[PDB]
Amino acid sequence: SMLKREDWYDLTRTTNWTPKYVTENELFPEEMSGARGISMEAWEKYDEPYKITYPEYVSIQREKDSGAYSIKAALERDGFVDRADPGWVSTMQLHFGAIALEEYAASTAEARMARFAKAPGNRNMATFGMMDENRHGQIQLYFPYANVKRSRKWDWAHKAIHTNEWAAIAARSFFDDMMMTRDSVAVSIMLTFAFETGFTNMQFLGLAADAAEAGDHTFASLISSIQTDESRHAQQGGPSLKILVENGKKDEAQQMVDVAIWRSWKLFSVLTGPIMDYYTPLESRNQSFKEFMLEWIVAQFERQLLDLGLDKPWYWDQFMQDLDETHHGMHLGVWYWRPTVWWDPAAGVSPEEREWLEEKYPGWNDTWGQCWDVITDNLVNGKPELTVPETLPTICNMCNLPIAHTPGNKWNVKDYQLEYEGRLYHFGSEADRWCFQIDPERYKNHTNLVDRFLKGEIQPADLAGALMYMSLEPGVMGDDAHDYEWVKAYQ
Amino acid sequence: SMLKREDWYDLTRTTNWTPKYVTENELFPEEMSGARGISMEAWEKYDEPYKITYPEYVSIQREKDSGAYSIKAALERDGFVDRADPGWVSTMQLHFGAIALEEYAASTAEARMARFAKAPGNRNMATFGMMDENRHGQIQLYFPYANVKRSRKWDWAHKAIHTNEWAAIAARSFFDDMMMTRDSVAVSIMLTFAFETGFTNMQFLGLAADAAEAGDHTFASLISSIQTDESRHAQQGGPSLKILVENGKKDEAQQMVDVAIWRSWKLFSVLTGPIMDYYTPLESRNQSFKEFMLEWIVAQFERQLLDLGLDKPWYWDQFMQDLDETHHGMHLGVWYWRPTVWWDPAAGVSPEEREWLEEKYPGWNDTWGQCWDVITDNLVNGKPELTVPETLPTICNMCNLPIAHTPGNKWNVKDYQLEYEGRLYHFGSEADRWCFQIDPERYKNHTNLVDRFLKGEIQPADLAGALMYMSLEPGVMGDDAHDYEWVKAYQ
Amino acid sequence: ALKPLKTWSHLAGNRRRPSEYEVVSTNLHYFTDNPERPWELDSNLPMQTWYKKYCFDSPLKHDDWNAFRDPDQLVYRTYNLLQDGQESYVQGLFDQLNDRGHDQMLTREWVETLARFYTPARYLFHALQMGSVYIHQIAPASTITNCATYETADHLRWLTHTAYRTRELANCYPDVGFGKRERDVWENDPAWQGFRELIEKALIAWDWGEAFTAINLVTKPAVEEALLQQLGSLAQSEGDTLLGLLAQAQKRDAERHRRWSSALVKMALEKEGNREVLQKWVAKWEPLADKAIEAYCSALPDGENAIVEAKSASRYVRQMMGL
Amino acid sequence: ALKPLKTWSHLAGNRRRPSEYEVVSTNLHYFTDNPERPWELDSNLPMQTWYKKYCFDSPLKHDDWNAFRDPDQLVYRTYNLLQDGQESYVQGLFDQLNDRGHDQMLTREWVETLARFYTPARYLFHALQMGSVYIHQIAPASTITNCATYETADHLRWLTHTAYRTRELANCYPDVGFGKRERDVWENDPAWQGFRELIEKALIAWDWGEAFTAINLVTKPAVEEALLQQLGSLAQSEGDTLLGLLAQAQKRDAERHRRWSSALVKMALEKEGNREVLQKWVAKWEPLADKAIEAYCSALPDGENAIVEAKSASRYVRQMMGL
Amino acid sequence: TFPIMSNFERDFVIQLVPVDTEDTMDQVAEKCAYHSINRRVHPQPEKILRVRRHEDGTLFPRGMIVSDAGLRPTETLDIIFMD
Amino acid sequence: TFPIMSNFERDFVIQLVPVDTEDTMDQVAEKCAYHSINRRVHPQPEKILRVRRHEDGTLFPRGMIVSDAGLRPTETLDIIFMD
Ligand SMILES: [Mn+2]
Numbered sequence A, B: 001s002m003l004k005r006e007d008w009y010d011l012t013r014t015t016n017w018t019p020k021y022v023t024e025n026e027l028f029p030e031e032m033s034g035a036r037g038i039s040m041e042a043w044e045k046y047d048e049p050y051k052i053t054y055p056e057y058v059s060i061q062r063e064k065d066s067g068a069y070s071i072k073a074a075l076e077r078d079g080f081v082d083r084a085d086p087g088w089v090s091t092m093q094l095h096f097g098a099i100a101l102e103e104y105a106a107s108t109a110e111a112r113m114a115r116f117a118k119a120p121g122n123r124n125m126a127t128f129g130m131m132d133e134n135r136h137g138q139i140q141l142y143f144p145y146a147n148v149k150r151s152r153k154w155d156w157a158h159k160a161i162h163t164n165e166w167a168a169i170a171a172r173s174f175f176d177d178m179m180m181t182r183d184s185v186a187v188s189i190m191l192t193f194a195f196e197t198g199f200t201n202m203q204f205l206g207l208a209a210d211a212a213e214a215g216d217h218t219f220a221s222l223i224s225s226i227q228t229d230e231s232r233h234a235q236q237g238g239p240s241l242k243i244l245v246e247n248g249k250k251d252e253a254q255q256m257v258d259v260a261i262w263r264s265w266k267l268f269s270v271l272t273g274p275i276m277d278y279y280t281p282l283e284s285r286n287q288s289f290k291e292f293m294l295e296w297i298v299a300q301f302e303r304q305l306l307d308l309g310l311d312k313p314w315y316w317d318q319f320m321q322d323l324d325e326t327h328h329g330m331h332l333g334v335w336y337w338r339p340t341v342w343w344d345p346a347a348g349v350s351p352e353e354r355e356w357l358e359e360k361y362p363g364w365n366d367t368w369g370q371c372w373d374v375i376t377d378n379l380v381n382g383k384p385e386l387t388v389p390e391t392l393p394t395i396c397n398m399c400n401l402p403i404a405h406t407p408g409n410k411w412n413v414k415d416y417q418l419e420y421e422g423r424l425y426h427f428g429s430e431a432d433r434w435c436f437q438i439d440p441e442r443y444k445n446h447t448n449l450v451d452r453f454l455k456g457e458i459q460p461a462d463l464a465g466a467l468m469y470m471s472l473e474p475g476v477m478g479d480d481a482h483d484y485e486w487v488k489a490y491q
Numbered sequence C, D: 001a002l003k004p005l006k007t008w009s010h011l012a013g014n015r016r017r018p019s020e021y022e023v024v025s026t027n028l029h030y031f032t033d034n035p036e037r038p039w040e041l042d043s044n045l046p047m048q049t050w051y052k053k054y055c056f057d058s059p060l061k062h063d064d065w066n067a068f069r070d071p072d073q074l075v076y077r078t079y080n081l082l083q084d085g086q087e088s089y090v091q092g093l094f095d096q097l098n099d100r101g102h103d104q105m106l107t108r109e110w111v112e113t114l115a116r117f118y119t120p121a122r123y124l125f126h127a128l129q130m131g132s133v134y135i136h137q138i139a140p141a142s143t144i145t146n147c148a149t150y151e152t153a154d155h156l157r158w159l160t161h162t163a164y165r166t167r168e169l170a171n172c173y174p175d176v177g178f179g180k181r182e183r184d185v186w187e188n189d190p191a192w193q194g195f196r197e198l199i200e201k202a203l204i205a206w207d208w209g210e211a212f213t214a215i216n217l218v219t220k221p222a223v224e225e226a227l228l229q230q231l232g233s234l235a236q237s238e239g240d241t242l243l244g245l246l247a248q249a250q251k252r253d254a255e256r257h258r259r260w261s262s263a264l265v266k267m268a269l270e271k272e273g274n275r276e277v278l279q280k281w282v283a284k285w286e287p288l289a290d291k292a293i294e295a296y297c298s299a300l301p302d303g304e305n306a307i308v309e310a311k312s313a314s315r316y317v318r319q320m321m322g323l
Numbered sequence E, F: 001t002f003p004i005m006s007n008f009e010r011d012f013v014i015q016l017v018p019v020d021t022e023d024t025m026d027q028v029a030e031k032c033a034y035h036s037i038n039r040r041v042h043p044q045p046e047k048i049l050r051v052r053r054h055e056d057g058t059l060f061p062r063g064m065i066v067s068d069a070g071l072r073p074t075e076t077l078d079i080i081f082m083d
């Protein structure tokens, strides 16, 4: 017979001991551990909500891949990707390039806790999380690999994060800040709690649904499977936060959550928002990006923050408001600067789509609809040349994204500048500038693409030069997803 | 370390022994064993071409189901079956009802060899084949089970073979003759060699392709997986035949092959031929039923028969010729008598389709096209009542299928009658009557649907009564697959 | 018009939603639809007669054999998951005990014991394989047949282990005759003649009920107690941990066969007269089982004690079924 | 316009089609793209400095660490298939040896031996888990990291076996303290202090090269020979076939770790000067390994002999690598 | 009642057709035409339908009755277009 | 050359716009309009474009030159429609 798991589980995490041949601080350096004065004994109260043992893991994860890889091989020669909507295809290329290697990097972020966490239970769970991200990085390379002969863009699934293309810089800015350069406790909070439990756990659920709605079962199976692993290791932040509040560190806990959530939000506003409000066909849009955020992200954050004795971030209302603008600014930026990304941005501003947008965002056409009016007329009158840039947009020195906002009638674009130690910084929001000020030593000498351009680090110092600097060439350089098909509807 | 399979395989089949407490004939009764005078030592030269051990089997078959069931669950809620072409849907309903329980019955046919075969190697391979058909019967019940709430017809996946609906009688006639009522050696020949290796091994390959072409990946995965098992146990007949020829039984071997092949052909002419020449959309037709037969079935039979020292059946040329008629007769019969089957027969005689048919079968419209002309005019002129029967067609007393052939200008319908012991029998071909005459004691007192009707065993003795006798009611009763949509093309 | 149901029509009438097991295993035999003519051919064919006499006219009766349910509820899909795990265990044992040279440290006395009492079982195990596969093709219901189907696979499984193991033994002790002498031992060693007579006679009991009784209720417990329990228990004592563990791993399949056999008997006892029918068959076969156990175990060390325990344990199997 | 390739652009230039292993495991670390500023933030952050000092400035050098290839070519998908099979074997052993009451027939002397020399290893195994997971996050190439990734999982695997096994032992011998006394034994028993000092010091060697050497080349062979080989060999002798087989099953993972470690060293020896760099680290750590082995094995029965064999076998690991 | 199998000219299938032992070949042919003409065979007013035993080919007189032609029940008959 | 960030009225994004230290607010505004007017902002011939420091709001004289307004490189300026 076998023992019941509950009868022996505790022993698997009864691994802390009192160092003697080296000191505790030597064994667990604060910069990597982040125990923050809390005793080892106190960190031992850490108790993971989702437990799992080695044997259960290898068995269950074996079947998950058996299924995912079996689905992929069964539909392989079906070549769905060839008849899929360009908005969808673009959605996948953006997804893989932006995330494949960050998934792999997350295994190191997990390894950080697995090694330096004073909480024994956190160390084992992080070992499994490490294994999960290893899977995620690998499976999200194996799948897109199937399309490399279709377009060079699929090569960015692997190449993207190795380039200085602006979106790649933005991604690395986020990820490195949240998980690669933080102590163990900080990672469990900013990454597993704030980003995974807070955003991706649900996003992936919605992504898997859209893939299914798009007819891409291979991709839907992929995302669903990955999501089940995330739902498991994302739990690590909860207990860390309780322990910090439970002691004398509620402020530190609060500050990390505030930073983490805002940064996750910014990245989210450029990578997900545009997709559901413009790339997914109108008939396949369940809800708007704003609705999705409220019904599946904001209510949960408040829920969670309450159970932990934490407060809503000071920027919560602004955040609530920004759900009506930000992602529209990000989409317009990406589309207008489409040759600077590796996927084909879908305009999504046809008559049918334009009213859907006014319906979901009253006041859209009065503001955003304006910029799009000009762009549309130019295309109708044979002036494409005016729908692509001849300069670089101002980049935020925190989220490394373009500083944009409400245009047209209700114009309200602003720049929260800041001069620090003889240099001028630009921020796309109050929160972005705050993130910097509360911890300037962490971002001080970093330079965004524009800073580098202004410093002469991009040569030749012109558009063509900026493109080579970002490793972009015709073939991968983005253009309108539906090849301006949506223009015919305007005479 | 582990041993190489080749080092110990022989021992797994070194199981024959000399009985002492009972006699060999008692242990291996001729009626079940069919050793036919060949010694046990001589049967021991049996050497399977495809070997497999228990451990390899359970491991490999575990993954086959992991994949098939994983595909099915991933596409389940996609509900492809709801948007699939009616010709396809009908193809599946016909397939399941006609084969699910015959697949299960085949495990007993395998069990017959596993127990009564004097060849040790045949006994083990039959044990695995028994397990294969157990899988086939079960998996082909589990899959259609998913659609029982869509239509009562899906219930026939389980019910069909329990009824006296004519197609069910035809199927049981074939299967019981070939595998349920034959000695072990006879089963290995007539079933695994003649039917599986000879017809189904390739058919399933083509079926899996069409499913893929139809967009039904769940079904394509199903058929592909099953096919791999068949490709394995279908090998059993080869060695049996060699041993019989190798000794003094080439005639007996020849006679079984001739019977088996013709009967397999007849069933095949009603269940598969119509499907690829009329149910599969025109744009998805790789080749014609006749082409498929020549390129994938007839050449192989000759190939095989040569390597074994056997001759082509005496009816080979007639068979070659019949590829231009038979299945067209079966299709017209099924369609005209559509309310007597459990699926919706597709007419497949629209302008576009009619020339495809003339293209693949020159002289079609001159003959078959005639009967269809009248049927079409009647429908155009509001006389549907003349496109459904008011009588029963003459049924063959061997294959239990309607006696039909070339109509119209080149009219050539014939009936190879035979009076035996005071009774008149009807046969749809020379070969059908021969099958009976070479072994009359095997079919003598059997009665087909018409015989039963004429004997007063169907009451009330009219159409409505025949329908209840066959367990058919509105809802499952067949009608035109595309609801006569193809009629609009005729004014 | 007929409206679609939620389950198969023959299961429409259940309080609870049918399980996969019921969906893929029930009411599948069609030869029972026409007791007067099981197969769709002439009613006088030899096979027509065989099923009428050995299936339909069996003294073990019931009005609805299709109601039988496998207590383990095995389906092909779950059978393989289950056995693939068990084979990973057994094959792992083979591989790693081989690695530490487990066979080389066996004594000469024990190796000879293996040659006489262990490797020849490949014949008895295949005989059970034949015995259970016949039950498969003559049983009155598809749920009963399936139990016989999986059991047959387990018997082939034991044969296979034995075959593999005989090869390994012949490699380290080529002069013993492993692989070559088993047949003559099975056919002429007085230690095996008890079992051989038993199974040879059992193999020609064509009545599905008597076959079930002779094979599953009488012969198997006798074989399992003698070859797996006793010889396995002795193997452990003599330093052969591989056989000791191998036998116990096979006992797991044997125990599952007992579970469905016990369920079938239980169902049979629902009808008046069946207990008596079963006891009469047991009373007929039991004497041969006793003889088989005595001839085998008596030749083993501490033989008399092996006989008492085997007889007792095998009889206990039927007692717990109410006989 | 750029034309699509047949493989990843960084693999376009191979004679043969890239394997799944190469497709999902190569050139994935991006922190090595900017040695002057590994992370996309201020170049003076503590983590920026940690990677420059412990990864980039390691004395173990090579111009293309991304060229490293795991000889076993493990990927997550194949790692799980592999280990799920091995766990079916180990878990099968637990289940069935428990069934035949394997623990109840252990002598009191051996049970106490298990309390002192066996169950406390949960601390040393988790320490290796920590040791290898650190190698994971500081190694210069993704193919090297992955090897450390899977190795970490194996270490957690050994911990797990030990945890489970400690529970079972505490059930049949509740007065020994199984489950409660391990920490104090690990921290105060002179038999363990050799290993404890070794791993505690090894755990703070931040240089990726020295970490690899101290953990994979020096500490592990010493732990594996002492705890798996010696104690396991003794277990077999004392009648504990479970531990004897369990240890051998873990040795399989240990052997795989040696295989990739040997490959990494081989690659390192391509560059002039690395052999000397490696020998200097080995020369620094070897003395602590010797001390660990002596303190552990000397306390075991026939202790002096266990010391000689462990020392010899562990040193052989590095000799076969050319040191 | 007397059953015969109708192999109507130009049709594709032979079918069961109940007739009377009193009917004449003409009336038999009329009962057969019902199941073929205008169903899947074009009429031919410019011709006459004849009844002949399918096996030996014998052609029966239009006014001859079923009972005189002998015939075995279920006997197959060809119904053909003539003059 | 001197770089400034252009936050053109009615547009949605602030952008990099190179100007000369000699240019006047008028000419600066003309260099900014190039990247906004007719690209994503409708012209307004019936109005004048003014240049004001985004941070404090200061409005600069149309004829005043970049070099006199002081300004920090990359300084953000609002280009607005007036009279
Ligand atoms: Mn992940």
Ligand SMILES: [Mn+2]
Pocket (backbone or CB within 6 Å): A106, A133, A196, A230, A233
């Ligand atoms: Mn994650």
Ligand SMILES: [Mn+2]
Pocket (backbone or CB within 6 Å): B103, B106, B132, B133, B136, B230
């Ligand atoms: Mn099959």
Ligand SMILES: [Mn+2]
Pocket (backbone or CB within 6 Å): B106, B133, B196, B230, B233
């Ligand atoms: Mn088959």
